[PDB]
Design a protein around this ligand. Structure first.
Ligand SMILES: OC[C@H]1O[C@@H](O[C@H]2[C@H](O)[C@@H](O)[C@H](O[C@H]3[C@H](O)[C@@H](O)[C@H](O)O[C@@H]3CO)O[C@@H]2CO)[C@H](O)[C@@H](O)[C@@H]1O
Length: 389
């Protein structure tokens, strides 16, 4: 029975995790900087607190742009790699499964503080096969070096090939009417990254590798993602993101969610989210291919009554994930404000809770971990909070 295989068990072993967001991914004027977006430097204590809270995994998005020497070698500045190495091993010290990647290098929108510097350019790769070739060489050289640095680190360290690749229009643009050209290239980049990771030798030969689809959208993934040919069986996982529905979870234009909410995104609640998880479960988990959410979340609310809807959202979706053998990592950017972009629940320097962050963390983790067979989507649903409208 493929859903009962070792790879899906490894997928589930990541449980509910946490992103060191706006940290090694932060960047401006063409260069990443750990503190560049207001977060202070991570410490062992950061990761200790994560393990203590019950997270099983941690994702350290890294933006490499600015620390890459010239072609043809694309040498990564050693200090930058040292710091990545160092963090990965702090996480290992705390008993966490660890994910690293190529992050804002691939940022595909126009709203960037590093305009002109995103070498990982999907429109430009589609535009010409020559520029597609340069990008592939750079992806190769970068993954070879990362692989070589971590050759003695085992399957507790996961590599995620790319982040959220796109053309600016978030999966509503030319990708829907170019005859699959954008999707074909992205699949080719994943292939090239997997090739390079495996060629790094050592424990990279049997390391789990996460591969995304277009803009990390679950549906565009199930429709167009082609899993790369691999040198070993059962060592690829599908990476997806979800902040659905965005205007509730991300922008906080609406502040309630689900069947008991009144201030809701219209017609988009419990059924839609589980439908999305079911398509992933039928496409991948049922076929022995693990899926994880590299990023999921909902921002913090100003009122206690709206916050209860946030906890409800977490309890419900995280249970639905558990039951579909899907693991997931919460997006934490360190920002303690409420509303738009207010994702911070754990301090990035100390690993202590920010504001009421503990309730959210407990909500997502406990719901996923719960092994009481009476605790179901029905019971969670029936205890949805009361609308304050
Ligand atoms: O605060 C200073 C800088 O913030 C930058 O915005 C970032 C958000 O604060 C962050 O939460 C968001 O996270 C992304 C994630 O990186 C991505 O993989 C996924 O697709 O969506 C998440 C949630 O949107 O990233 C943005 C930037 O990409 C500003 O860009 C910057 O100008 C500002 O100084």
């Amino acid at each position: 029975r493929p859903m009962d295989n070792e790879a899906v068990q490894f997928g589930m072993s990541m449980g509910i995790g946490w992103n060191l967001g706006n940290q090694m991914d932060a960047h401006y004027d063409g260069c990443s900087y750990e503190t560049g977006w207001g977060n202070k430097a991570a410490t062992q204590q950061t990761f200790n607190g994560l393990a203590k809270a019950g997270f099983r995994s941690v994702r350290i998005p890294v933006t490499w742009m600015g620390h890459i020497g010239n072609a043809p070698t694309y040498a990564i500045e050693r200090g930058w790699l040292d710091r990545v190495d160092e963090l990965v091993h702090m996480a290992h010290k705390a008993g966490l499964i660890v994910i690293i990647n190529i992050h804002h290098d691939g940022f595909g929108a126009a709203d960037t503080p590093s305009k002109g510097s995103h070498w990982l350019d999907l429109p430009a790769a589609v535009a010409s096969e020559e520029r597609n070739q340069l990008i592939k060489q750079e992806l190769t050289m970068i993954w070879l070096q990362i692989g070589k640095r971590f050759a003695n680190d085992g399957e507790w360290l996961v590599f995620e090939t790319l982040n959220a690749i796109q053309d600016g229009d978030w999966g509503n643009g030319n990708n829907r009417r170019d005859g699959g050209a954008q999707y074909r290239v992205l699949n080719e980049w994943n292939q090239v990254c997997v090739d390079a990771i495996r060629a790094a030798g050592g424990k990279n030969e049997t390391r789990y590798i996460g591969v995304p689809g277009y803009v990390c959208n679950p549906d565009l993934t199930v429709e167009n993602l082609v899993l790369p040919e691999d040198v070993v069986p059962n060592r690829l996982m599908v990476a997806v993101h979800s902040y659905d529905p965005w205007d509730y979870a991300g922008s906080a234009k609406y502040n309630e969610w689900g069947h008991t909410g009144k201030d809701v995104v219209p017609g988009v609640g419990e059924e839609a989210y589980v439908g999305m998880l079911n398509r992933l479960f039928n496409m991948y988990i049922r076929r022995g291919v693990p899926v994880y959410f590299g990023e999921f979340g909902a921002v913090r609310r100003a009122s206690k009554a709206d916050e209860e809807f946030r906890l409800y959202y977490f309890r419900y979706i995280c249970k639905a994930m558990r039951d579909r053998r899907i693991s997931a990592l919460y997006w934490d950017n360190g920002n303690s404000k409420a509303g738009n972009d207010g994702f911070g629940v754990i301090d990035h320097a100390t690993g202590r809770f920010i504001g009421n962050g503990e309730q959210a963390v407990r909500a997502m983790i406990d719901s996923w971990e719960n092994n009481d067979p009476n605790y179901t989507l029905q019971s969670i649903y029936d205890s949805a909070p009361e609308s304050s409208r």
